[PDB]
């Protein structure tokens, strides 16, 4: 499903992918990369099958991808009507019924009117004379683009930061921006126990405040609750993220957290969007204090930087280490980095090693002299473009 | 379904009882009281029906009560296997299968073996070599005779008194002994709002500690969550009980709490059993401090007395006022009350008025001279029978 990777021959190991038979939909694009345009006159694919698995394997060759569905109570339809009656375009209920006539479900050829009542129960809409008007919670969910199923929990979770908040460490702030667990990694309970003990006093205060139990944490799982289970994984996700925003080595997290670098950036990129949705959610809800704390946490989670390097990182060519070594060079803001000597940044970038050998996302490799010039050159354009 | 009340003629108002048709089972005993033994030679019943309701009414006359069922995942079967494998009589799983052959379900003519796994998940039983052995939670539930469905919540609720407990007022202790809400009374939200404001500083601290919200209490219900709903009614049940154990007038509770005297004693008798099950539950679980606080709360909820009159009330003829007025007579314990002058208690019992005119449960009416003598006479027998 990624970027086009042309190749003359494509080989598939088994019709069974991860204990399940290969889907036809991904099989069409499985082979579709075979054959380069204007270079290779013949492209081929060799699916590999054994014993009785050949009968299952051949079915994909003569099979066709399944026809599309609409997937539309349904959780994907609650947002559908919340996206239109809160924007103000559709207000009357009868006109809303015509919207359900415009969807994929209607075009393919009851409970739509019974689903707006679900939103009525959860305060998402106020009932008037029927003509519907959005509420404070309803308009905040739409602006932040959260699923209404998740918002009901967040609203009761964010409001539980009113009772008690900690500010010495970023953990409690991070706990409210960790999206979920999904299946980003396989948890290691015994490894979590050793980490649980070594946590300083300040961080352990956070866990007790959000439902995580010191008495039960990597204790009963060894010897052997869905909402309780999704909190402990939420806490582990927040523990990993705190090391990410502390700029600890990514290799060191592997040796300490058990999850490799592949699932780390697939989480810090996913958790950075969450911080960008909680901040907007709190903005429209009139919580000006909470928006202040989470305002800077979208930039920190994306790049794994501290508060100091937030301004340096605005340059697109400084991801996580090209700004730290540059920060130690006496350059603490992007305003004066724009006026840096071109020959000065060459030597400082040469050091800190853990002709097109330096790399920048989007332009493949680059040489050190050009990229260092690009560091200043991008900083020139930022200074006057935003003012 | 109560005590036999003979009468020569029985009249029923409607075949519809409380918006529902009358059940045949209660109808058999509904009329069964007609005709006194040896006095009335003829007993009759006249069901009253109107318009088209006669067709529904006559069906009961020619109808027969439904045949019995077994009502046996099922919540009434989880306790069944827990009642036998924790007592130690049945240990091997194969013998347990013979127990399911001995029940009403088997005699009437699969999931039984799949239900012990449910107990395995919730730590109720430890798995050994299959031979099953009870755990600390499993043996505590059986001794206290609680349903295993309710225990899982109580165990996590009683253990949440570990974090923080209050001792100035009996509210938090009472909150953990209020059984449920069921349908004991119809709640009055506006009346609860006025009561919520006038609550003192000490009692309001309890509500925040158990999940009741000051911000949301008789606030959103007026303008318009099952576990959140079962807590707010639990709190109202605890507020009512605190007045009961404060010996406030029962008439005054009606004017203040909206629930009449009928549903009060039908709750303080039901909540007194709960305090007698939580205390035993905490005893077997090795919580010696919690058993200390709840030890005296079964006697207090039964009789609506304070701590002072606990010893006086041991006499079966002192319910709630015959001990309070007697307490003010300088008699503070049942030991020295047993030695009271017989003529002395006559005058003190005559006063405090809110020949068989004084009433004692179980023996219908009584005269003051005899009952006052019975007050001392019962106190004689207690002193040496328990020593």
UniProtKB/Swiss-Prot annotation, chains A, B:
Subcellular location: Nucleus; Chromosome
Highest rank taxon of the organism: Eukaryota
Modification after translation (UniProt): Phosphorylated by PLK1; promoting interaction with TOPBP1 and recruitment to DNA damage sites.
Region (Interaction with RAD51): 355-387
Tissue expression notes: Highly expressed in testis.
Disease tied to this entry: Breast cancer: A common malignancy originating from breast epithelial tissue. Breast neoplasms can be distinguished by their histologic pattern. Invasive ductal carcinoma is by far the most common type. Breast cancer is etiologically and genetically heterogeneous. Important genetic factors have been indicated by familial occurrence and bilateral involvement. Mutations at more than one locus can be involved in different families or even in the same case.
Family, as annotated: Belongs to the DNA polymerase type-A family.
Notes concerning its domains: The loop 2 region is involved in the binding of the 2 ends of resected double-strand breaks and homomultimerization.
Function statement: Low-fidelity DNA polymerase with a helicase activity that promotes microhomology-mediated end-joining (MMEJ), an alternative non-homologous end-joining (NHEJ) machinery required to repair double-strand breaks in DNA during mitosis. MMEJ is an error-prone repair pathway that produces deletions of sequences from the strand being repaired and promotes genomic rearrangements, such as telomere fusions, some of them leading to cellular transformation. MMEJ is required during mitosis to repair persistent double-strand breaks that originate in S-phase.
Subunit structure: Homomultimer; forms homodimers and homotetramers. Interacts with RAD51. Interacts with ORC2 and ORC4. Interacts with RHNO1; interaction takes place during mitosis and promotes POLQ recruitment to DNA damage sites. Interacts (when phosphorylated) with TOPBP1 (via BRCT domains 7 and 8); promoting POLQ recruitment to DNA damage sites.
Entry protein name: DNA polymerase theta
Protein species of origin: Homo sapiens (Human)
Classification lineage: Eukaryota, Metazoa, Chordata, Craniata, Vertebrata
Portion of the parent chain present: 448 to 891 of 2590
